[PDB]
Amino acid sequence: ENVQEFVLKEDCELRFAAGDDSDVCLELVKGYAEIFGTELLLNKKYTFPAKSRVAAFTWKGATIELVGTTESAYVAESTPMVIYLNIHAAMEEVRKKREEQAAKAKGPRLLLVGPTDVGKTTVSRILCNYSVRQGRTPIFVELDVGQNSVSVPGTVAAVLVQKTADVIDGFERNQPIVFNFGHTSPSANLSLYEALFKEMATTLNAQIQENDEAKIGGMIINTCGWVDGEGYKCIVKAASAFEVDVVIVLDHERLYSDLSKELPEFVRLTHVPKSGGVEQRTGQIRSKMRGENVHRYFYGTRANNLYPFTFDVSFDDVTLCKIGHETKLVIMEPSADIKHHLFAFSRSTKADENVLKSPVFGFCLVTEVDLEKRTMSILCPQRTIPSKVLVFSDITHLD
Numbered sequence: 001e002n003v004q005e006f007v008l009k010e011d012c013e014l015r016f017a018a019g020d021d022s023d024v025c026l027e028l029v030k031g032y033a034e035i036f037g038t039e040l041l042l043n044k045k046y047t048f049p050a051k052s053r054v055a056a057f058t059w060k061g062a063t064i065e066l067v068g069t070t071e072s073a074y075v076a077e078s079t080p081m082v083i084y085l086n087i088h089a090a091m092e093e094v095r096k097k098r099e100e101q102a103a104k105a106k107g108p109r110l111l112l113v114g115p116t117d118v119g120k121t122t123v124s125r126i127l128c129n130y131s132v133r134q135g136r137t138p139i140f141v142e143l144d145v146g147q148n149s150v151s152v153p154g155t156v157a158a159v160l161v162q163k164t165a166d167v168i169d170g171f172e173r174n175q176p177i178v179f180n181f182g183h184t185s186p187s188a189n190l191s192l193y194e195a196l197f198k199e200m201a202t203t204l205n206a207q208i209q210e211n212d213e214a215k216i217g218g219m220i221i222n223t224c225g226w227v228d229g230e231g232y233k234c235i236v237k238a239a240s241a242f243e244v245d246v247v248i249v250l251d252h253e254r255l256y257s258d259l260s261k262e263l264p265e266f267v268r269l270t271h272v273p274k275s276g277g278v279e280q281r282t283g284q285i286r287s288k289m290r291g292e293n294v295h296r297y298f299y300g301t302r303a304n305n306l307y308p309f310t311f312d313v314s315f316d317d318v319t320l321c322k323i324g325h326e327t328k329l330v331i332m333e334p335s336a337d338i339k340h341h342l343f344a345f346s347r348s349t350k351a352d353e354n355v356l357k358s359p360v361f362g363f364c365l366v367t368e369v370d371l372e373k374r375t376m377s378i379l380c381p382q383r384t385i386p387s388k389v390l391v392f393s394d395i396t397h398l399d
């Protein structure tokens with residue numbers, strides 16, 4: 001196999017993209033390095049799948065080996081990494097101050113805002129990892145219903161972060177709090193989207209009353225890239241509902257300017273540039289990555305393989321339901337049009353008013369529809385159905 005060697009001076013990062021066909025294996029052979037906030041272990045082999053875009057950053061200097069065919073591979077001497085460090089350090093200062101005034105202390109809450117392709121997910125991951133490396137357990141909140149690092153597309157989700165992200169796999173799905181939105185864009189149902197992140201905020205505020213570490217750990221909140229029109233109001237409303245102390249704007253000066261004049265005076269507002277290592281995505285890439293996200297939910301990853309079950313379910317044993325006048329509940333009759341659609345197992349025992357704002361156990365995929373036998377084949381993470389109430393999602397997946 002073809003080998004590439006890289007010498008990284010202090011405060012430099014190796015930016016590489018895996019080829020379209022082949023895996024790239026990374027090894028740190030000298031010094032200290034990190035990938036999006038997670039420390040790399042010396043001489044450990046990290047295998048990245050095809051089309052992976054990765055930055056390995058070093059604070060003090062590193063030598064890194066790459067094995068395999070790369071699409072691109074170069075060392076960048078200029079990064080916004082110290083900015084993220086200073087943001088983290090400022091949050092930890094707020095923690096210390098509030099801990100010394102409680103005799104429980106509530107952790108600082110940060111809102112990340114900006115358009116698509118600015119590295120918002122990457123920055124959230126770094127900030128969470130740094131909090132973990134400080135000894136904290138932050139709550140990571142994902143409001144982006146298009147691309148979700150916690151659950152499937154069409155979800156508003158949150159996880160308690162107790163360990164640094166796996167270099168390849170990201171953060172562990174340690175009992176996630178997931179709400180089903182059922183659309184890739186908030187513009188499909190604006191009143192429901194607002195209701196869901198307000199419910200998320202209310203849920204978490206009550207959860208942290210039972211957990212001191214989660215409370216002081218604070219919140220890092222990722223938004224969708226919709227900054228124009230009604231999307232701007234969602235940002236202001238998310239900031240209010242989550243009672244954020246800090247708003248970080250990535251690469252959008254007009255949004256920064258507008259938020260500085262509307263947000264309460266106590267809210268610290270920081271504009272940061274996007275990393276030069278962020279590549280812009282097209283519609284095809286996002287659609288492919290959404291499909292890859294669904295596939296990861298059921299089947300897992302290379303390192304952590306999940307084994308989903310494929311079993312038949314009678315329509316008499318389940319209740320199919322759809323949301324959408326906008327927040328109105330609709331009972332679904334078994335049809336051919338439910339094929340390839342995702343369905344959420346609601347935590348509500350009855351298909352009624354409670355379904356709208358209830359979290360979900362998880363998701364299944366309807367693969368086959370047997371209208372003659374009155375059964376449907378579903379791909380499900382567990383052996384039996386966790387709920388009899390199945391909530392419709394407009395997200396389709398071909399498997």
Ligand SMILES: Nc1ncnc2c1ncn2[C@@H]1O[C@H](COP(=O)(O)OP(=O)(O)OP(=O)(O)O)[C@@H](O)[C@H]1O
Nearest residue numbers: 015053054055116117118119120121122147275277
């Ligand atoms: N400094 C960097 N060097 C190299 N690659 C990077 C860097 N930062 C981010 N990337 C890569 O760019 C891609 C997009 O990053 P990320 O998902 O954080 O952007 P985003 O704006 O949150 O995405 P979206 O546009 O879907 O909202 C990812 O594959 C990530 O690995």
Ligand SMILES: [Mn+2]
Nearest residue numbers: 120121144147
């Ligand atoms: Mn993102």
